[PDB]
Design a protein around this ligand. Sequence first.
Ligand SMILES: Nc1nc2c(ncn2[C@@H]2O[C@H](COP(=O)(O)OP(=O)(O)OP(=O)(O)O)[C@@H](O)[C@H]2O)c(=O)[nH]1
Lengths: 770, 857
Amino acid sequence: NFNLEHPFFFTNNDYSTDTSIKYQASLPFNWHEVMNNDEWVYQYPIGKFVERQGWKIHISSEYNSSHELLQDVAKICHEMRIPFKHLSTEDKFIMRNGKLVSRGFSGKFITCYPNQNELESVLQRLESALKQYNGPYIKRWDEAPIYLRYGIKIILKEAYTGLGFDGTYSSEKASECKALKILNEWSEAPKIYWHGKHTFLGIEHMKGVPLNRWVTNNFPLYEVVDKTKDYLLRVSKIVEKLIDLTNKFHSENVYHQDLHLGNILVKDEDEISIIDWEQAVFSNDEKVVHKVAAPGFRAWRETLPSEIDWYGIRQIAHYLYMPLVTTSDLTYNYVSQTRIEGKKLFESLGYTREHIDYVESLLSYLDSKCPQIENISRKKVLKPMHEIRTIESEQDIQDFIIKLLRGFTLTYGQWRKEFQSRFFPVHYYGLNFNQGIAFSDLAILWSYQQLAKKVKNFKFDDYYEIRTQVINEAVNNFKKSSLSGLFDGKIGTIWLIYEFEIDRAVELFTTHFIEIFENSQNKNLYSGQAILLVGLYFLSKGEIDNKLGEEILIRLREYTLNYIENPETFCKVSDVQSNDPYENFGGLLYGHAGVAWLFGEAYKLTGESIYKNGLELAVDKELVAYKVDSNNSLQYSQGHRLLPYLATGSAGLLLLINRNKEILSSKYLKYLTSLERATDVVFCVLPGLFNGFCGLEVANNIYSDIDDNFSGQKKLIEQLYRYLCVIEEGFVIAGDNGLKITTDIASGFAGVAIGLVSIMDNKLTILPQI
Amino acid sequence: YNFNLEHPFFFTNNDYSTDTSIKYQASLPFNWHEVMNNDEWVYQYPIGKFVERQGWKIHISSEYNSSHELLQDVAKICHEMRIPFKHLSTEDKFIMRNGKLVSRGFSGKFITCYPNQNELESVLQRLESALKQYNGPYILSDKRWDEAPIYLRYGVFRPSRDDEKKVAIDELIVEVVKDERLPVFKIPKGIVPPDFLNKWLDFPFIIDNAIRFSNSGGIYNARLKEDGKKIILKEARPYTGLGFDGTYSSEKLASECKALKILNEWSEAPKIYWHGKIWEHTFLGIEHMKGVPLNRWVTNNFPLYEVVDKTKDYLLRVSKIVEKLIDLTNKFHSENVYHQDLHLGNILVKDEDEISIIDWEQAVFSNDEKVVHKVAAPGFRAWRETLPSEIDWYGIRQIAHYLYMPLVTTSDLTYNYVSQTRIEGKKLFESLGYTREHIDYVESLLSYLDSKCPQIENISRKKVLKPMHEIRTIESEQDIQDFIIKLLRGFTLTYGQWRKEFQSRFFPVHYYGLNFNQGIAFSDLAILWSYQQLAKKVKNFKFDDYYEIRTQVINEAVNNFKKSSLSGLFDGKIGTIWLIYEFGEIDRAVELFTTHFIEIFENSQNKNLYSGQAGILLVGLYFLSKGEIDNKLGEEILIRLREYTLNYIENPETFCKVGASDVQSNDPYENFGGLLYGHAGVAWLFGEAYKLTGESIYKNGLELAVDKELVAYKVDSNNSLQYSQGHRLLPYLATGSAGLLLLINRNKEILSSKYLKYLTSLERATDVVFCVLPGLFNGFCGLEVANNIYSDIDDNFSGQKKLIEQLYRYLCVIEEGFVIAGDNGLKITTDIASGFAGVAIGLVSIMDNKLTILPQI
Ligand SMILES: Nc1nc2c(ncn2[C@@H]2O[C@H](COP(=O)(O)OP(=O)(O)OP(=O)(O)O)[C@@H](O)[C@H]2O)c(=O)[nH]1
């Protein structure tokens, strides 16, 4: 679960390809170099009695004086004077030192391992080359960088720490204090209240909130908020304050170089306050590439410092129209599409035409300072969208899905050329779980063949040989890993192969079901034992061996009874604010809210009414966990994260409530239309099935009979157009936390694929029945 | 088929390669794309526009001094209307293709555009009128269009189309049209007349000899008219010829013209005759010298035998030439000229031992700088940015050390390689019998010369290859016991240094067999067989990791086993079965043998022991001699070997080629003849069959095999039998003479007394004091495994002593262990073809008396 990215695609930490300066050192007679740990090179003589542990000596230096210190230490230590190891990469030197890194290992550039009882002159000789150099502190021994071993009522700060890829220390970046002292006239900028040297310069804290919660409090997400319109008048007030103060402080030789979600702060009556003037450089003759900034805001390819801030001051006012800003690091000039997709939404709300046209003309004459920059790279293959249509007929939907299926083949094509480990592009969380109906290719292929089956007379190409050269390593790696479960576990592959090869899945299931089922302990649907769905699905049509079938049937009966006496125990029916799957709780993906499907299938099979009793017990244990929202409906309770979604929140609750009509009573149907009002929003900030808009639109209309749901296609496509970055004759959808492209079940090609095939075929084709 | 690629340590395949030059990037509007198809070009075409194949294309070239301006000056022309284009990616491929090491059929290819056939004049008039001040090379197999660089040709636009009939990707889509990519233009099967192009479409030297024609031309023999006499010509087209620096061909002929005009009173340096410029070419009239080079001078003068020196005085003949070289250094250094690249294709010695340095195509004229010796020879390549005067003196030093002993081919890999050679040279030159004054004078002049080239200490990561300064003599078995564990621990170090980075294979191999993976060849499993046969050979080993890697090599050498399709004993899917049998395991793959032995047998053509069915029959008779296969296939092997012998007896021409031929090479698939790669290994089957069955026809087949193999053996000046192809002699094991001595000496009682009299001549022929290669197929270790493998009496100690001493002459040292250098030594290879496993099985069979590489009875 770590992030390391190159342009265009996404990958893991294996793809580095470091190109820097090799360190290089000499070597005496009967000595050696070795790259043992692949991050340190170790020097050692041949014949010497090496002990274990003892003492270690650490020496740290600055960036510029590394190689001459290395030469002096080498000429001291090579002549029968102790083995030696050091850092092996100039590129990794700025991650070992510099800015905020891991607290356990920081510094420690030069290391030696003395032979216990010979230190009477080595430490004395190490002040010869030292005592005039420098370095970070990381315990002190003398007046030299020689060490021994066996953050942020005035808010303050702290000062060789903070080095980037260029030479700019955090103490150096002087710039902040000169920018504060030349801008002490205005109360929007903070004041300086401490001078001198670990230096402790302080600032005044202006009141306010960050603009993201201002967007969630002022930019509408439900239709009942912000009565009598007039929100665009406030938006005009903030952007007129930005243009006024921008023209006031760009008079005399000062620039900010970053105007992201930070450094802006609105208190009351639309009063901004720019804080933390830290990245202040100024020139107007040479051109500088924008080096360091927040994600979503990055200037391009060696322009003037007057127009570095141009893109930032355009975009900071641009996403106030409709906030989708984080995907501009991949698609240059992305923000044109947000304007035209916010204008139609604002007209659909019913705002005044004067306010909308004034805001559009205001952004137009801010764009009147318009220096495009024809950047020259390989990122420019993914050009923006400049065409917006309207869906009325079914052939438009067929054209959209045959366009979208091409982008899947195109994002498959470029992945195989430079990478060989997996078969398909990934998300950053589940980039190694290469099995099951989860973040894995085996769940991608059957969505592909389904949507090839649905549309029209598709080209057969060569996907037969592709499917067999996928299923060969699938049956190879059925068992060479750990864990168990349905989604990313063990026997989801059996269900997918049977839903794909019939006989092999049946005989692996009947030879491994009792062996794998007793190994797992939990009962949740992700990686537990509810497996019972696969067993009941194989039992209802009938392919299981008989006597083991009744044995596992009375087994699941007695675990159902045992669950009837005990509390929830295995899961919680969790005040953590995370998107993380293992930390997720209280949903259909994670919790006891999904066992209602398992109880309902057993009730639906012949006659078992103890599973009905399990249904009332499960819903009575599950209904307490949800808090109420403003619009009189149930909502997920933890933090300020009021997200009604398929997982955790309201949409999964509406899915589980309307699962079976026959089990319902008048006590159950007390929150039907209020919960439907909960899942009726004008904006979803991230797309997808598990954590996005597509799961909401699936849960809004799945089991309300009929098939003619063209309002559903209209709403889904006309709200899904805002998330797409176009390629040649196709689309590739950026996933959740979107900076790169993603193809998985949650946020990718397969999410939209499963969503559309579930809306067309109203059975929601995950966790099956019959 | 060769696939050579530079890499520090081990030389590998074309996979470790990253372009680190300034890349070329263009801009695209909407409805355009940037497909990167096949790693050379980047494809660009408007989206939705059907490109019409099978028309006319334009090749555009450029110079290195201004090429970006061609990109940003022709980009709006392709942006206007509809023109696809594809251009080269980085500057490194532009250097590699607009240079000197690339073929003339593919040179000058930078921009390729794709017009339609109906728009050619309209695009050509627009692009021609804006490129007046651009210029570049000619590009072969095209024709001149106007004055701007524009060259047309007939070529392939796209691959095969969507849903109609295609036959190829290169020919006419009308009869077959073969590709004729030669530096001429071809109009195939008449012409459909291009009305845009029909109007536009319509020396005091005599040629003597072309020694080369290279890429930029080069040295060209001819005859002058107004002066007569003999002359040579150097030619150089403008804007071609390019190193890894801004430097062209015409920037060096002017430099050597200056360097040969500044000095004129030296009779052994050539005099300029006519430095004229025909058209834009730079021709050059240079006189010719008589004589032979030093590279072939040591072939017939260095004592290879111990009688060939013709009554002493060889070292004085060395010393006069050496003092002639050391005299002619500061004579032209007074003019402050400097001549780089002092390799041994420039010092030519004529009659009465007079020298003449003839190649001057690198010449600086100032000395305060440190440059990389960028263009050099194999062996004389210098050591990272010293001043050019000591670069020249370093070249002089290694000239003198090749004159001392003729191995300097690996001095690029190990710094101060001259140390080991200078240590062994006194023992080489004192073991033959010479006066001490000559050796004293040679070492005195060398000890004068060695201090004018200053030593350096940086080495740059190849530090673990140190020269050897700790030599010993062999007079006890404990020396052999120490050497075997040292070599084995060095092989462990080799596996440790190979396991770090690469994983496509398991062991380092020579670059000939860089793709093969099985058998007693360039492989993996035979190396562990040698490892096991040497590890328990003394008493034991530590065995830190041998068990799990043995399990690994068997369960991914046996699991696939059929991915490649090739037959033979050496590398051909049945030697794999033999190594599984002889590793110490159970017979195991006998089921696979009975499954597909007839299938492997029935679909092969060659019958040599390298990759033919003769080794398959040897494996079969070995398994029948072990005593358990089946009741039926044992009869099938005999009923096939019967009439396999008879097709050879009635017609020996099909199974092998007799004669000497005209081939000077080292590739394993070319050199016919000899014990392994030819005819002399056929009689090994007849010997094994006679030792199993005992009947006369096998003996007669062996006698005819020995009779018809000895045709291609030319007698030396001394009484010695030598294998000879071309102008070279081959007294080696594989394609040589020591292979026949095994066949004669092993079957001594079977053979009659008529063929037993050749042993006294082949013992003289396989007795040299010097070799150039440290190997056993084609090297040294095979020449003294034939000496003591089957005598009668156990006298292993003296032969072992000689082998270990001359291997100390050839080895290289890492840590406490040891490595060895393979064929074409610039690297470290560990296999059974001039590697660690070969010297391992040599040290096995030198006292075990078996020669375990070939399966006996
Ligand atoms: N000057 C001269 N050259 C000859 C003679 N005979 C052959 N040559 C040619 O000189 C060439 C020397 O080429 P190399 O030794 O490869 O060196 P080079 O290719 O000239 O490159 P540089 O050594 O950098 O000039 C040979 O390839 C021969 O073709 C001769 O008598 N005199």
